[PDB]
């Protein structure tokens, strides 16, 4: 359980394999290691594949089935929907640029406008954690000038979740997809 500073992305991935070797997750240790990694753009350029119209998810590592490590690429003004995480852990670290996280409570069955518990401005190398026990959230790149890049870890992996309309609180089932896997573009 000796946590060391990841010196490279590859080194980080090797450490993460160790932390997820078991059946349980020490959230604070996983988070400390993600934060300790200093983003080196050359190490992840292979995965940072952008799309003009919306943010992309780019698979980096399947964590031997225990988690998915992915890189998300956000153009100017690109955001996600209000999402849940399908009963899994969800770590977020900024690699480049800024993202705004907005937290939302689980809604009632009564159609009502969802209200923002809070929000925070995530900056380079910072890390956020969320799970359904905590609540829901939206992630956005509100910048007009700088693309954003983040590293995400989900455990267990999930390819389906729910999106929430902020006006009613109504949820609909969504399937996630990858823009690339292992640096390979996948239609
Ligand atoms: Na959630």
Swiss-Prot record:
Copy out the cofactor comment.
Binds 1 Fe cation per subunit. Ni(2+) and Zn(2+) can be used to a lesser extent.
The UniProt catalytic activity note for this protein reads: L-cysteine + O2 = 3-sulfino-L-alanine + H(+)
Arranged from A to Z, the UniProt key words for this protein are: Dioxygenase, Iron, Metal-binding, Oxidoreductase, Thioether bond
Instruction: Give the GO biological process terms.
Output: cysteine metabolic process; L-cysteine catabolic process; L-cysteine metabolic process; lactation; response to amino acid; response to azide; response to cAMP; response to ethanol
Involved pathway(s): Organosulfur biosynthesis; taurine biosynthesis; hypotaurine from L-cysteine: step 1/2
Tissue range of expression?
Highest levels in liver. Significant expression also in kidney, lung and brain.
Which cofactor does the UniProt annotation name? Fe cation; Ni(2+); Zn(2+)
* Enzyme Commission designation: 1.13.11.20
Specify the cross-link site (3'-(S-cysteinyl)-tyrosine (Cys-Tyr)).
90-154
Can you name one GO molecular function term for this protein?
cysteine dioxygenase activity
Return the InterPro entries for the record. Answer: CDO_1, RmlC-like_jellyroll, RmlC_Cupin_sf
Q: What induces it?
A: By increase of sulfur amino acid intake.
**GO CC terms of this entry:** cytosol
State its role. Answer: Catalyzes the oxidation of cysteine to cysteine sulfinic acid with addition of molecular dioxygen.
Family recorded in the similarity comment: Belongs to the cysteine dioxygenase family.
Q: How does it assemble?
A: Monomer.
Put simply, this protein is called Cysteine dioxygenase type 1
**Species name:** Rattus norvegicus (Rat)
């Amino acid at each position: 359980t000796e946590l060391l500073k990841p010196r490279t992305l590859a080194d980080l991935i090797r450490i993460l394999h160790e932390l997820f070797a078991g059946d349980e997750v020490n959230v604070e240790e996983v988070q400390a290691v993600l934060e300790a990694y200093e983003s080196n753009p050359a190490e992840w350029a292979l995965y940072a594949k952008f799309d003009q119209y919306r943010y992309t998810r780019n698979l980096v590592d399947q964590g031997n089935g225990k988690f998915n490590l992915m890189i998300l690429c956000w153009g100017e003004g690109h955001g996600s929907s209000i999402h849940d995480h399908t009963d899994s852990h969800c770590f977020l670290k900024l690699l480049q640029g800024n993202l705004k996280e907005t937290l939302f409570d689980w809604p009632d069955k009564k159609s009502n406008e969802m209200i923002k518990k809070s929000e925070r401005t995530l900056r380079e190398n910072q890390c956020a954690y969320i799970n359904d026990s905590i609540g829901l959230h939206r992630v956005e790149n509100v910048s007009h000038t700088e693309p954003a890049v983040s590293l995400h870890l989900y455990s267990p992996p999930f390819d389906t979740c729910h999106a929430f309309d902020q006006r009613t609180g109504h949820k609909n089932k969504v399937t996630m997809t990858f823009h690339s896997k292992f640096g390979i573009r996948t239609p």
